[PDB]
A = this chain, B = another copy of it.
Amino acid sequence: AIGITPSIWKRSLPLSLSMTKETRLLDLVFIWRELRSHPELLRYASDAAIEAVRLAHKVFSLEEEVSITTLDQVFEMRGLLAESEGLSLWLEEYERARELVKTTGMKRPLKLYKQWLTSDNVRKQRAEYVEVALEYLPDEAVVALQQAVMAKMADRNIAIECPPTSQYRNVSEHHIFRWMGLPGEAIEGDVPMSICLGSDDPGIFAADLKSEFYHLFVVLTRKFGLSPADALRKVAEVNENGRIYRFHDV
């Protein structure tokens, strides 16, 4: 999602895509969170906030007023174990909710999250479907969200295993090249992200890590015009990322 461009992500897709209300609300909250500080995307942030409050109004069947701030509070508690205190080694996260229920000001987020978890009406509304326009956010805004997630990943030093894989006609349109920073594929505000290699091709017989390495080398040398040395450097950086971020015991 953070490698595919909005340009080549909507190529044979219907002008309206239907999702679940829970995903729609969470997406609106995420848009607000990430575009609050963007001076050029404040309109989109505000519209996302307004739509999020509205959709929360039915999803929760709320009669009162719920602000985007308290919606954010509610949705930051998704990491809590459901059956902790609101519904040996497991003891820590059994009580992890106790700190939350101790905070005197965490009332309405807590009860709202409990409705989100247990209420049959809220669960039916969560499974409900709603339509979203393909151009709900412009390409610029989608790229801004992608680059924000990129920056988060780079800051936390989280690597991305990228094997070669529906909307790509040719392999030269793959997002691995955008991540590797090839001219014409990288976008202005991109951030390097420590891509690692993986031998996983969904629709091929008899694939190998060497096969994918050679495929990347061939694409780089023939379609991007890179010399063998430069192409080898680019593929080797990803391959070495595999070793740097290996899980093996040191």
Contacts and interface: CB of A to CB of B under 8 A. Distances in A.
B36 A108 contact: no
Contacts of A50: 69
A63 B11 contact: no
Contacts of A104: 57-58, 61-63
Contacts of A64: 107-108
B63 A105 contact: yes
A84 interface: no
Q: Is the interface of A mostly helix, strand, loop or mixed?
A: helix
Interface in A37-53: 37, 39-40, 42-43, 46, 50, 53
Contacts of A106: 57
Q: How large is the interface on A (under 10, 10 to 19, 20 to 34, 35 or more residues)?
A: 20 to 34
A56 B50 CA distance: 20
Number of copies: 3
A92 interface: no
A157 interface: yes
A186 to B, nearest CB: 16
Contact of A63 (B53, B58, B62, B107): B107
Interface in A52-73: 53-54, 56-58, 61-65, 67, 69-70
A84 to B, nearest CB: 21
A173 to B, nearest CB: 11
A228 interface: yes
Contacts of A169: 11-12
Interface string A180-212: 000000000000100000000000000000000
Given A42-B42, A62-B104, A67-B67, 5 more contacts: A37-B46, A39-B39, A50-B69, A57-B104, A65-B108
23 contacts: A12-B169, A36-B42, A36-B46, A37-B43, A39-B42, A42-B42, A53-B69, A56-B105, A57-B103, A57-B104, A57-B106, A58-B103, A58-B104, A61-B104, A62-B104, A63-B104, A64-B107, A64-B108, A65-B67, A65-B70, A65-B108, A67-B69, A192-B227
